[PDB]
Amino acid sequence: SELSYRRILLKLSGEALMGDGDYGIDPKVINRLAHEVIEAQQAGAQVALVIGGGNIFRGAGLAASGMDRVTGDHMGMLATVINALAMQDALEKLGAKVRVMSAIKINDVCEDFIRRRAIRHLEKGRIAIFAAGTGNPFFTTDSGAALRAIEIGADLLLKATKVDGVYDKDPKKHSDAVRYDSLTYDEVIMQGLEVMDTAAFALARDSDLPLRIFGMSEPGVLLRILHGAQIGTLVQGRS
Amino acid sequence: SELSYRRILLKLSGEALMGDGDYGIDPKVINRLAHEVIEAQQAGAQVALVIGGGNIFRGAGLAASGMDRVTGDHMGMLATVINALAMQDALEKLGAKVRVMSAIKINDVCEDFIRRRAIRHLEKGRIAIFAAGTGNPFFTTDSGAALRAIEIGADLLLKATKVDGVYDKDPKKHSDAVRYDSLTYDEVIMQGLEVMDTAAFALARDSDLPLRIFGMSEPGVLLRILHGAQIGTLVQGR
Amino acid sequence: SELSYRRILLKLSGEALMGDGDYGIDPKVINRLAHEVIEAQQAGAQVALVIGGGNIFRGAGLAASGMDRVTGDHMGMLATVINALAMQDALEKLGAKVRVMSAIKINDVCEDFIRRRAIRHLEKGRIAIFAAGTGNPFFTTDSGAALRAIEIGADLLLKATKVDGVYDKDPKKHSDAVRYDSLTYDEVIMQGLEVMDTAAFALARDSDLPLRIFGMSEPGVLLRILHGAQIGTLVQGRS
Amino acid sequence: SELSYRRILLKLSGEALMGDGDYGIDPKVINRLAHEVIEAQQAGAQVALVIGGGNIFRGAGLAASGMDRVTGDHMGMLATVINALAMQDALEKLGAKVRVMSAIKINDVCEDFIRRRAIRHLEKGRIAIFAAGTGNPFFTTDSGAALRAIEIGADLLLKATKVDGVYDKDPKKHSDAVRYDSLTYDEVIMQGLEVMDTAAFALARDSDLPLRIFGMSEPGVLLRILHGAQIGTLVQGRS
Amino acid sequence: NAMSELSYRRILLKLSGEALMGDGDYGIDPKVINRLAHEVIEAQQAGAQVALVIGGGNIFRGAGLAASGMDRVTGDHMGMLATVINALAMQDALEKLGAKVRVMSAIKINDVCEDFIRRRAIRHLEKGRIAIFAAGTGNPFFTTDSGAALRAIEIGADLLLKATKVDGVYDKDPKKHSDAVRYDSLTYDEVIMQGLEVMDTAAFALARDSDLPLRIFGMSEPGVLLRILHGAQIGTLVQGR
Amino acid sequence: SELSYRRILLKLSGEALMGDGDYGIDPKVINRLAHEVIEAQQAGAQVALVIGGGNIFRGAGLAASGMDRVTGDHMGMLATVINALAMQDALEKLGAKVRVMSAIKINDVCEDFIRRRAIRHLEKGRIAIFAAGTGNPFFTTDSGAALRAIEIGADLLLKATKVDGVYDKDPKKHSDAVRYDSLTYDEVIMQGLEVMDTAAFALARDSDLPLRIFGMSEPGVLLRILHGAQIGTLVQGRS
Numbered sequence A, C, D, F: 001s002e003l004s005y006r007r008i009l010l011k012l013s014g015e016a017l018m019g020d021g022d023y024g025i026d027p028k029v030i031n032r033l034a035h036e037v038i039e040a041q042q043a044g045a046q047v048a049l050v051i052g053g054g055n056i057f058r059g060a061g062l063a064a065s066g067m068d069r070v071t072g073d074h075m076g077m078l079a080t081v082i083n084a085l086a087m088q089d090a091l092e093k094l095g096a097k098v099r100v101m102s103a104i105k106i107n108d109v110c111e112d113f114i115r116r117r118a119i120r121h122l123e124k125g126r127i128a129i130f131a132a133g134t135g136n137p138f139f140t141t142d143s144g145a146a147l148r149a150i151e152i153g154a155d156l157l158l159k160a161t162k163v164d165g166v167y168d169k170d171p172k173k174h175s176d177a178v179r180y181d182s183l184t185y186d187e188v189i190m191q192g193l194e195v196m197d198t199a200a201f202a203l204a205r206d207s208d209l210p211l212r213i214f215g216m217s218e219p220g221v222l223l224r225i226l227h228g229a230q231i232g233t234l235v236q237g238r239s
Numbered sequence B: 001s002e003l004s005y006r007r008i009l010l011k012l013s014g015e016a017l018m019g020d021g022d023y024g025i026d027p028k029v030i031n032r033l034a035h036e037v038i039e040a041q042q043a044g045a046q047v048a049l050v051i052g053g054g055n056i057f058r059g060a061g062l063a064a065s066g067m068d069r070v071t072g073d074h075m076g077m078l079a080t081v082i083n084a085l086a087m088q089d090a091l092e093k094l095g096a097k098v099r100v101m102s103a104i105k106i107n108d109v110c111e112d113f114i115r116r117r118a119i120r121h122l123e124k125g126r127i128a129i130f131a132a133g134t135g136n137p138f139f140t141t142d143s144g145a146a147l148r149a150i151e152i153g154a155d156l157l158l159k160a161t162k163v164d165g166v167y168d169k170d171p172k173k174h175s176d177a178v179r180y181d182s183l184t185y186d187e188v189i190m191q192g193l194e195v196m197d198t199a200a201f202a203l204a205r206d207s208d209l210p211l212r213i214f215g216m217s218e219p220g221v222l223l224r225i226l227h228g229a230q231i232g233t234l235v236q237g238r
Numbered sequence E: 001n002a003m004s005e006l007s008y009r010r011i012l013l014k015l016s017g018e019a020l021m022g023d024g025d026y027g028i029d030p031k032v033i034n035r036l037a038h039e040v041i042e043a044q045q046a047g048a049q050v051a052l053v054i055g056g057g058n059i060f061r062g063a064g065l066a067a068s069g070m071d072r073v074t075g076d077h078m079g080m081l082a083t084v085i086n087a088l089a090m091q092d093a094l095e096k097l098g099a100k101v102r103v104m105s106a107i108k109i110n111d112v113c114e115d116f117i118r119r120r121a122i123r124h125l126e127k128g129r130i131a132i133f134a135a136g137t138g139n140p141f142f143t144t145d146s147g148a149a150l151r152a153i154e155i156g157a158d159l160l161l162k163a164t165k166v167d168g169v170y171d172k173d174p175k176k177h178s179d180a181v182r183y184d185s186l187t188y189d190e191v192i193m194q195g196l197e198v199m200d201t202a203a204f205a206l207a208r209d210s211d212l213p214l215r216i217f218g219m220s221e222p223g224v225l226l227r228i229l230h231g232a233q234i235g236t237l238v239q240g241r
Ligand SMILES: Nc1nc2c(ncn2[C@@H]2O[C@H](COP(=O)(O)OP(=O)(O)OP(=O)(O)O)[C@@H](O)[C@H]2O)c(=O)[nH]1
Pocket: A098, A099, A100, A106, A107, A108, A109, A110, A111, A112, C114, C116, C117, C120
């Protein structure tokens, strides 16, 4: 119809999946998220999802020290597959065709990431769900999210965080805090504002990937954003 | 030298790994479980390990009731790799050599189960840690476990569960069942006792695989069983 | 459709491919079976085949009494890949679209087995042919057939054998052997009647897989069955 | 030290395994052959084997007259994996160390072929058994043996046949059939003699591979040839 | 462009890697790469199903890479990888002109392109895609020509076109005989008999085994490929016995 | 014995292999390099090397500015396998044991990168050659070298460049220039000195990987460095 962003990639921490739970997934949250996503898709947007695995890579048993750093990242990556698999069902049950694609080979469980396939999947009206990040350890979920966004040539990367947008002085350690309507990559760096870890930000800044930091709490957000509403902060261009 | 069982495979429900917490794993039961395992290799035994994923694959959101079974089984498989890796890491810190092997290919994370390879690894005195069951959906963790046991030509499949063995009707409820110090295969079927699901039990039976249902509550239980200790039940023969 | 069952899985022993020879494939038998299959498909049936390998993996040299059981199972598995390849070329000679899918990776030769892919193929009018059982040793052709049936959500698993159905008394012992029309998994277990090995039978038992044991003596029979013919013995139900 | 040839590749047809039978493998024949291979390997030879598949890929059912040639060849390649597996067993029963290596990937069943791995296996004293030819249709087993020979740096390529060497006229037509002791590659082609198919013969020639065509007529033949004995025909050099 | 004008339906066109070089001494001349792409697209528009095979000699060259005493196999792998690079270049030039391309490799490099599967390759031809085949047969010791003939037979091609410097097969060396003539056609046998070079022995036999029609010609001027496809007697045709 | 660094990763440009050429590999530059590496080896160091592909993926034809960036990065990754394959040949000629590992699967040609395998190889005294960077487009060779260095627990990442260290200005037109002997990561950032691209540096910063930026002008610099010598610039520390 009238979209301001044709192809998008929505990334979330996955702790966000837990909800008020302390672990795993909360059927309530995943149900709303799947619904948000399905509205986006129906509206005409080719949608891609990235979801971290922090809801599963939890506890002293797992996330506590000693654990070989590489081994923990591998585990984390498996966790994001499990999550991707749950979004796949929740969504298909609701009529969408889903294509989970993993940055590491686990062919039994889901297909391999291949840029040319992914694009064709988005073009056919399917939801792309990416898992396992970039495929290497030492890279955050934002990095893989950025990379994937750039590969598929997305119009916008949506990073859903607890705080809705970027603020000057914490929406807590201040009452007067104002939400930047928009920012350039440089304005961010110059003002020491932090959005994604250095590497992930550089990656996004080299391709000038439109970023949007925002909440996700209120239903209909994707629909507003797709239709133009200035929601959260928008990171774009290079001053 | 001088053991009742030379190549062994130890099977845990994984939900075991949780112990205190309701999810994931607690380092306590892991470290100790690793020790029990180290100790067997010390004795001079060839050890295999298979652990479930129900500790990571749990909760309403993940193990949803109206959930596709395959999707769900894949998730469980994945869960078992996670636990497999945790054990690898814990076991390696204590200096032991290990080899995690997956029934479904995930080479980034660990090698593929290759029968000739898993065996070879045991001969070099490494601990084989198998994950992802048989790599098929609809098969229990028991099935995968029996399969691998037969595969490596294991002398003994050890299943650690809640109850300390195989009881007629269970402990407490009905003049405290007498723990059969043994029980042929056909006997288990005739009497309709539970050990493993039909399919798993059938596999184990067909190759005449010595079972052994027991509890790992006291530390040192494994070292004893190997020597000759008659703990828990022991399923065998016809 | 114009037939009761639409998505079915037909399983033969493959020894049932040698006809009157003592090892190969019999052009008679395979052309005859091709027509049956082509016919059903032409009537809207989504057909999957599983054919064993006892016609290739035979002889003292190959099925040596001793011999590593695992390496024997691997020969049987490859045997089924060869049969499937033959069933492919025969079906394609008659204008059918075929997808052979093996449970062990041999991608040069035929496509890997992937549940989602297989269904797709089926709902596209193609004949799916599965080879190499469950991909595991110590598992019979039937287990592999039950597994695939459940996986693809077939309405019926047809197992073609010598004895047409199941009888109370042994049909070669008594002339007064009675053939049941139907039976429940319990009724079979309890009467200690044998239709598949324990494992295979159990697998299908956990999914109430509608089994049909029958003899593929004369042509037409496959089509009659899809219409509702009380041929052989139906096994279905937890009763 | 006493050897005229340290690394050799011995190629046999698949029919060489059947014995008097009309299919599969004769336990007694594969045993002799195994014994002869051990005798060589113990005298300090490094041995690669290549066995064809015509003992399994035979009969009007499998080797159908007008079947798809690619499908035909793939069936054959699978036939060879089955033979190599049987050879492996036989050899291993008698304490030999063995590595089956396939030209197409079937990792479940046997390891992949990789030139560096293979040469290494040979250095360690293992018997190398190569299956599936070149991994391509339209190429013969002879071509696959020639290829493997060059890749592993064989000192000699042996091709075991029914007729002990190359005779001017078939040793059944004119009773005065004379055997050649040595022939250049060019002499063979010149005399229109039929040793290997054109492509395989050219690979042998261009790679400078001495080639001995002989029959395994009696025990100890392989070992003798290994010590320089002139049995059968030697194809070497150019004109 | 009337499909009724097609003398050949499915073709495989084969070039040496050096062709992409043009005047430079290395790699790819974008001038050359574009004209090739234009010729190919032109053939596709006439209704042809087009398969492509380009060697790696433009990249695997120089004392350093192709050193006289290096390991023959690693050398061949190098060429194979060169071939994958060329194919990607072609993929990008063709796609930029609106063509739909599928690179397929004889050795698995799945990040980079799909691997060769016969039945897949054929379906791509059916759907109107240009197939670009890389890495020969996937084995060392086989020439590009060998991979080319294999692929041609495997996809059921009506013709294998090998582009070379010389514009056909002459009865005699034209650089040595002024009376030398270009054959319009030759049987596979007449080539052997007259000791004429067309492909190395192994690749010729494989082509000969399946009676693959071959057309040896020179891509000297634009439009030559479309003319061949419309029946032009250009270069030399090898076919039959 | 001595040795101030046990496990190193030496990273080269690629064009560094060209020498007096405009493309490819100068066999002179490659041999004295092998020599340097082999010397570092024969002194007890465990050596991993990473070489770019700029010598091969260049010229408007290959490195076309208007070309799809992903497929260009892929061409680059392939060029680095070629380079790796040539180093391997030269080093083995001089008697070294070499393991070439690529970040994207190409098993025919070399092995996959697997962190535990690479460590093992390094413990058995083999030279590890890493090709294809991280396996993702949009990532530099630096990024790849930093990753591998961390993954393998390198004690030092050497980066050979055009000039002999980090300077406060261009030393080729300025005899004025001041070379820094050592810098902290945070110093490099605030002084705006270019060492690596931002992502690579952050990747290197997070694990506090010791960097040694130096020029391989004269034979023996590698060895000297291994022995404590203070050549080029050292980057390290978090002040
Ligand atoms: N687990 C797993 N699933 C796969 C793989 N490849 C494809 N699939 C799934 O199989 C289903 C259908 O397979 P595809 O082969 O992608 O079929 P397609 O022709 O693109 O799609 P349709 O047009 O919908 O038939 C999809 O839902 C994919 O998610 C794989 O390698 N592994």
